[PDB]
Design an enzyme around this catalytic site. Structure first.
Site, PDB file in Angstrom:
ATOM      1  N   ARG A   1     -11.520  -9.812   2.072  1.00 58.33           N
ATOM      2  CA  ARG A   1     -10.427 -10.035   2.653  1.00 58.33           C
ATOM      3  C   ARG A   1      -9.693  -8.502   1.692  1.00 58.33           C
ATOM      4  O   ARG A   1      -8.309  -7.906   2.021  1.00 58.33           O
ATOM      5  CB  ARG A   1      -9.464 -10.976   2.006  1.00 58.33           C
ATOM      6  CG  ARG A   1      -9.997 -11.202   0.251  1.00 58.33           C
ATOM      7  CD  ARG A   1      -8.630 -13.139   0.994  1.00 58.33           C
ATOM      8  NE  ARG A   1      -9.120 -13.230  -0.743  1.00 58.33           N
ATOM      9  CZ  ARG A   1     -10.659 -13.963  -1.289  1.00 58.33           C
ATOM     10  NH1 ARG A   1     -10.898 -14.234  -0.408  1.00 58.33           N
ATOM     11  NH2 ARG A   1     -10.118 -14.493  -2.738  1.00 58.33           N
TER      12      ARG A   1
ATOM     13  N   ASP B   1      -6.006  -1.844  -4.857  1.00 53.71           N
ATOM     14  CA  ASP B   1      -6.192  -1.538  -5.715  1.00 53.71           C
ATOM     15  C   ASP B   1      -5.034  -1.986  -7.071  1.00 53.71           C
ATOM     16  O   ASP B   1      -4.715  -0.914  -7.719  1.00 53.71           O
ATOM     17  CB  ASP B   1      -6.611   0.039  -6.283  1.00 53.71           C
ATOM     18  CG  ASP B   1      -6.708   0.704  -5.740  1.00 53.71           C
ATOM     19  OD1 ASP B   1      -6.725   1.691  -5.552  1.00 53.71           O
ATOM     20  OD2 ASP B   1      -5.790   0.405  -4.151  1.00 53.71           O
TER      21      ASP B   1
HETATM   22  C1  LIG Z   1      -3.698  -0.877  -2.560  1.00 52.89           C
HETATM   23  C2  LIG Z   1      -4.475  -1.456  -1.605  1.00 52.89           C
HETATM   24  N1  LIG Z   1      -3.231  -3.501  -0.659  1.00 52.89           N
HETATM   25  N2  LIG Z   1      -3.289  -4.217  -1.128  1.00 52.89           N
HETATM   26  C3  LIG Z   1      -2.442  -5.197  -0.803  1.00 52.89           C
HETATM   27  C4  LIG Z   1      -2.318  -3.816   0.352  1.00 52.89           C
HETATM   28  C5  LIG Z   1      -3.523  -2.857   0.731  1.00 52.89           C
HETATM   29  C6  LIG Z   1      -3.360  -2.479   1.681  1.00 52.89           C
HETATM   30  C7  LIG Z   1      -2.838  -0.432   1.375  1.00 52.89           C
HETATM   31  N3  LIG Z   1      -2.936   0.026   2.350  1.00 52.89           N
HETATM   32  C8  LIG Z   1      -2.928  -0.894   3.147  1.00 52.89           C
HETATM   33  N4  LIG Z   1      -3.448  -0.585   4.988  1.00 52.89           N
HETATM   34  C9  LIG Z   1      -3.371  -1.482   5.757  1.00 52.89           C
HETATM   35  C10 LIG Z   1      -3.704  -2.971   5.482  1.00 52.89           C
HETATM   36  C11 LIG Z   1      -3.664  -3.258   6.312  1.00 52.89           C
HETATM   37  C12 LIG Z   1      -4.101  -4.997   6.477  1.00 52.89           C
HETATM   38  C13 LIG Z   1      -4.945  -6.136   6.920  1.00 52.89           C
HETATM   39  C14 LIG Z   1      -4.040  -6.000   7.953  1.00 52.89           C
HETATM   40  N5  LIG Z   1      -4.234  -7.018   9.133  1.00 52.89           N
HETATM   41  C15 LIG Z   1      -2.951  -4.764   8.751  1.00 52.89           C
HETATM   42  C16 LIG Z   1      -2.614  -4.348   9.310  1.00 52.89           C
HETATM   43  O1  LIG Z   1      -1.586  -5.760   9.596  1.00 52.89           O
HETATM   44  N6  LIG Z   1      -3.210  -3.597  10.801  1.00 52.89           N
HETATM   45  C17 LIG Z   1      -2.003  -2.841  11.420  1.00 52.89           C
HETATM   46  C18 LIG Z   1      -4.185  -3.004  10.984  1.00 52.89           C
HETATM   47  C19 LIG Z   1      -2.689  -3.750   7.793  1.00 52.89           C
HETATM   48  C20 LIG Z   1      -3.628  -3.516   3.941  1.00 52.89           C
HETATM   49  C21 LIG Z   1      -2.970  -1.861   2.506  1.00 52.89           C
END
Ligand SMILES: CCn1nccc1-c1c[nH]c2ncc(-c3ccc(N)c(C(=O)N(C)C)c3)cc12
Length: 266
Positions: free
Chosen positions: A131, A145
């Site tokens: 996750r 991170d």
């Molecule tokens: C520092 C790293 N981090 N810590 C928490 C979140 C992130 C994160 C960074 N950049 C990110 N870019 C995308 C996502 C993310 C994760 C799950 C998802 N279901 C979605 C989503 O809705 N779509 C449109 C694909 C987007 C999470 C992060």
């Protein structure tokens, strides 16, 4: 510094990941016509320390910081957007003919590379799981991170009284004594490998988290996943040694996966 930027540079969109990561939003960096992720704050000092730590990390398999807004509230941490979401959902929803055994090795190699980097740079993650791994194009994997912490490799962190952990990813010494180190990350990495090999199955299936520790005490470990090579399962089991010092380093884990990935491609 060079990291500081205007809030007006970013147009905020919707909450990403169904809100599972808290106040992390999709956003548009207007200058570059670029979709980014933005962490906002709805404790202040802890949030600002996150921004400070992320400035220091640079690795192809750790989510890259792009900028910060830390002069006045509301505060932003601007980071790259990972288009395919988290690894758990990715593996569960994937075409297994595309995301084959060699791809599973490739993703494991990428994650261990990021972890070897943190090990070398005296950082600890403390929440390693599928996750918290993120997927880009062409099976690119980057470790999330935000919550990275400075800790000399070998040294220990003692968690705050009443802290709640994701039990099934949490090392025995963490569960019993609230002790965290690079070796508890190694334990969590083992559980992450199990997640990968099973294409996103929940660890210790059917077993309530409240009964996991007592199983671990009696030398119970999760069974070898179907189709998982014994050499990979051996690494998993090594990550799950009771004594933290008996667990391999991330340097050793990465070397093992690099060798296996190169041999699988050849
Ligand atoms: C520092 C790293 N981090 N810590 C928490 C979140 C992130 C994160 C960074 N950049 C990110 N870019 C995308 C996502 C993310 C994760 C799950 C998802 N279901 C979605 C989503 O809705 N779509 C449109 C694909 C987007 C999470 C992060």
């Amino acid at each position: 510094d060079k990291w500081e930027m205007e809030r007006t540079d970013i147009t905020m969109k919707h909450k990403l990941g169904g809100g599972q990561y808290g106040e992390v939003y999709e956003g548009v960096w207007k200058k570059y016509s670029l979709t980014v992720a933005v962490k906002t704050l709805k404790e202040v000092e802890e949030f600002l320390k996150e921004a400070a730590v992320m400035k220091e990390i640079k690795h192809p398999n750790l989510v890259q910081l792009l900028g910060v807004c830390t002069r006045e509230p509301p505060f932003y941490i601007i980071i790259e957007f990972m288009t395919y979401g988290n690894l758990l959902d990715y593996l569960r929803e994937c075409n297994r003919q595309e995301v084959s055994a060699v791809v599973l090795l490739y993703m494991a190699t990428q994650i261990s590379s990021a972890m070897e980097y943190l090990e070398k740079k005296n950082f600890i993650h403390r929440d390693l799981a599928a996750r918290n791994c993120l997927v880009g194009e062409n099976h690119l994997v980057k470790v999330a991170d935000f919550g990275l912490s400075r800790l000399m490799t070998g040294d220990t962190y003692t968690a705050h009284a009443g802290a709640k952990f994701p039990i099934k990813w949490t090392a025995p010494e963490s569960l019993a004594y609230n002790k965290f180190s690079i070796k508890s990350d190694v334990w969590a990495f083992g559980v992450l490998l199990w997640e990968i090999a099973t294409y996103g199955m929940s660890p210790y299936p059917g077993i309530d988290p409240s009964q996991v520790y007592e199983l671990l005490e009696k030398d119970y470990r999760m069974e070898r996943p179907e189709g998982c090579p014994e050499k990979v399962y051996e690494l998993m089991r090594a990550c799950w040694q009771w004594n933290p010092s008996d667990r391999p380093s991330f340097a050793e884990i990465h070397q093992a996966f690099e060798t296996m990935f190169q041999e699988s491609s050849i």
